[PDB]
């Protein structure tokens, strides 16, 4: 029926759009004509003839922008994938991490559907120069950075962090910390010691900049 099918298609389409925005915001190369994909084109291309959503045809690779690879010294390609199974097992997670290691990708994003067992949670850190991030579909229906209460976060490179530390004459542990696994930090994909600059907008004072450090 329409309730079991069209709502699922719309949720998957909005999740795809949010993942595209997330990958673009990290500095990877995504054109504006891919992120503004309407519902009709998504149903035409990424959906089956009988309305079923297929997800093995949805996974894609992302490469760094020239500006990003200029500012950031090292930055590789991601392979964002959507699992077809509703409840991912250890076997499919091991298959995914084996795929990521074999194809020599610097990072990977595993968008699961309903729930992931802790026996599969414990296996995402397994690869030394690569990292794996997991995102729930319901956590991807609405983009959190477009929310009014969330101001603009901007990650800073190591040279940028060093310049900030030199200007304010302080060590890394003195900045106000931000936890990883925070939704905004998960959106930006921040590592330990990486510094994000926040542009707050208060009515009284206008725009002013604060800083935060992961972990």
Partner 1 sequence: VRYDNSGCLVKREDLNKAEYVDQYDAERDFYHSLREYINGKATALANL
Partner 2 sequence: VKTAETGYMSRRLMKSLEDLSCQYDNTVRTSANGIVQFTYGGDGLDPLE
Partner 3 sequence: VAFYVQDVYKDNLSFIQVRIDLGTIDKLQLELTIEDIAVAITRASKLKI
Kindly list the residues in this chain that would bind partner 3 in the complex (CB under 8 A). 1, 3-4
| Cα angle: 73, vertex 74, 77; to 5 degrees | 140
Which one of residues 123, 141, 164, 184 is an interface residue with partner 1 (CB under 8 A)? Answer: 164
Binding track, positions 142-181, relative to partner 2; x by CB under 8 A = --------------------------xxx--xxxx-----
**205 touches partner 2 (CB under 8 A):** yes
Find which of partner 1, partner 2, partner 3, none residue 173 binds, CB within 5 to 8 Å per kind. partner 2
Choosing among partner 3, partner 1, partner 2, none, which partner's interface includes residue 1 (Cβ < 5 to 8 Å by kind)? Answer: partner 3
The first and second tokens of residue 166, run together, are 């030199």
Report the candidate in 110, 86, 87 with the shortest Cα–Cα distance to residue 98: 110
Q: Which two tokens stand for residue 37?
A: 């994909």
Nearest to 188 by CA among 150, 140, 155, 159: 155
| DSSP per position, 19-56 | HHHHHHHTTB---HHHHT--HHHHHHHSB-TTS-B-ST
By the rule CB under 8 A, 67 interacts with partner 1? no
Residues that bind partner 2 (CB under 8 A): 168-170, 173-176, 200, 202, 204-206, 208-211
């Amino acid at each position: 029926m329409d309730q079991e099918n069209e709502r699922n298609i719309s949720r998957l389409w909005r999740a795809f759009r949010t993942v595209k925005e997330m990958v673009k915001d990290r500095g990877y190369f995504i054109t504006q004509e891919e992120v503004e994909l309407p519902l009709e084109d998504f149903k035409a291309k990424y959906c089956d003839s009988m309305g079923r959503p297929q997800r093995k045809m949805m996974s894609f690779q992302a490469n760094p922008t020239e500006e990003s690879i200029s500012k950031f010294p090292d930055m590789g390609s991601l392979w964002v994938e959507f699992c077809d199974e509703p409840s991912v097992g250890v076997k499919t997670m091991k298959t995914f991490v084996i795929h990521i290691q074999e194809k020599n990708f610097q990072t990977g994003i595993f968008v699961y559907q309903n729930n992931i067992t802790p026996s599969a949670m414990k296996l995402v850190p397994s690869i030394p120069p690569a990292t794996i991030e997991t995102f729930n579909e319901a956590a991807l229906v609405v983009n959190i950075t477009h929310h009014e209460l969330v101001p603009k976060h901007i990650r800073l490179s190591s040279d940028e962090k060093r310049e900030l530390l030199k200007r304010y004459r302080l060590k890394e542990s003195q900045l106000p910390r931000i936890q990883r696994a925070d939704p905004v930090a998960l959106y930006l994909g921040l590592k330990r010691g990486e510094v994000v600059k926040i542009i707050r907008k208060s009515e009284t004072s206008g725009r002013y900049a604060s800083y935060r450090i992961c972990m």
